[PDB]
Amino acid sequence: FDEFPIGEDRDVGPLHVGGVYFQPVEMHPAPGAQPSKEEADCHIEADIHANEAGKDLGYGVGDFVPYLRVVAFLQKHGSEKVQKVMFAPMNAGDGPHYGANVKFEEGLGTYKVRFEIAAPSHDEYSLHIDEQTGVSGRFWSEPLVAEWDDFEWKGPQW
Amino acid sequence: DEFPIGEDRDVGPLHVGGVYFQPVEMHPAPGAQPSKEEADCHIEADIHANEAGKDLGYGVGDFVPYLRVVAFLQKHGSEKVQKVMFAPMNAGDGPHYGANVKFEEGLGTYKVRFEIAAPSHDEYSLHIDEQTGVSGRFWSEPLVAEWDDFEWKGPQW
Numbered sequence A: 001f002d003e004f005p006i007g008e009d010r011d012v013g014p015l016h017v018g019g020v021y022f023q024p025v026e027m028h029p030a031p032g033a034q035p036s037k038e039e040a041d042c043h044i045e046a047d048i049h050a051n052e053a054g055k056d057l058g059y060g061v062g063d064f065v066p067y068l069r070v071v072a073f074l075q076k077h078g079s080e081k082v083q084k085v086m087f088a089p090m091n092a093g094d095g096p097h098y099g100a101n102v103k104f105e106e107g108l109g110t111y112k113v114r115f116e117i118a119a120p121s122h123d124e125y126s127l128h129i130d131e132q133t134g135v136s137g138r139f140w141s142e143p144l145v146a147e148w149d150d151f152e153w154k155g156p157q158w
Numbered sequence B: 001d002e003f004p005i006g007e008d009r010d011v012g013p014l015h016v017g018g019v020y021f022q023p024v025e026m027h028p029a030p031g032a033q034p035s036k037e038e039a040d041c042h043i044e045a046d047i048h049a050n051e052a053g054k055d056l057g058y059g060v061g062d063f064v065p066y067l068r069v070v071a072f073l074q075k076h077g078s079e080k081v082q083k084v085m086f087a088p089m090n091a092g093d094g095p096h097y098g099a100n101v102k103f104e105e106g107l108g109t110y111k112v113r114f115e116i117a118a119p120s121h122d123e124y125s126l127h128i129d130e131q132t133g134v135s136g137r138f139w140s141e142p143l144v145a146e147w148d149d150f151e152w153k154g155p156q157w
């Protein structure tokens, strides 16, 4: 399946973050309130793996980082409207990622695309912190941001 | 120093290993598990994708997140069953499903059963189109990895 880049990959805190988009997909079960394959303009995927700093949190470097809460914000240049898109964790043929089928509500054009990545919720994940088996790192409190100021929505490339 | 609960099992698309060692301090402290000081040990369920595995879109050896893992402990000679809710967490050696555990029935031989449920309906999805798309589907009833002769003789540390 052809993947198209959103922009340059980012390294933010303990995460390596990439963004791609491609034709809308059919997901099972259909996640949250996302548009159907027919209603969507495309599928946007956030590829999140631990980088070297991720090692202090106990992640294997280069591995997928689960239990995160990822939200994308889309804002067309010259517009005050901002779309807020909740990403969901899911598997495609090339493994897990956070993604969503999305509509570019203000049409064709240039958009600021921002991914805000929050650490797992308090009751959803833990870290060993004892000396013997523990980690020296901790999760981030303020959400990490990977953003692209000039993404071009030029319509389906399929 | 890690000790096995028994031999690793392959159940459906999962490679499941069970180990135990000294109790640990976790942050946040998960559900109702005993503290490092209160506990007998820490038990870990290591769950990674096997060849079957690939059908769901995982890479062989990848940790499989979003599962709901519970362990049932039953001492040989007793009718009592103790239930242990595992929680997802990272240790210095990576992500695992684990729990600090106090053996309510004490020293002895136990049947140890891990029940592994697929992600909740609203917590994970699969791309199912021909194009992007995976052919396997998550299991309905929990997968089981069981050891019937686990010997708990007290701390080995």
Ligand SMILES: [Cl-]
Binding pocket: A073, A074, A075, A082, A112, A114
């Ligand atoms: Cl924005």
Ligand SMILES: [Cl-]
Binding pocket: A120, A121, A122
């Ligand atoms: Cl929270």
Ligand SMILES: [Cl-]
Binding pocket: A145
């Ligand atoms: Cl900012």
Ligand SMILES: [Cl-]
Binding pocket: B072, B073, B074, B081, B111, B112, B113
């Ligand atoms: Cl049992």
Ligand SMILES: [Zn+2]
Binding pocket: A043, A044, A045, A090, A091, A092, A097, A098, A099, A100, B127
């Ligand atoms: Zn996706």
Ligand SMILES: [Zn+2]
Binding pocket: A128, B042, B043, B044, B089, B090, B091, B096, B097, B098, B099
């Ligand atoms: Zn653990």
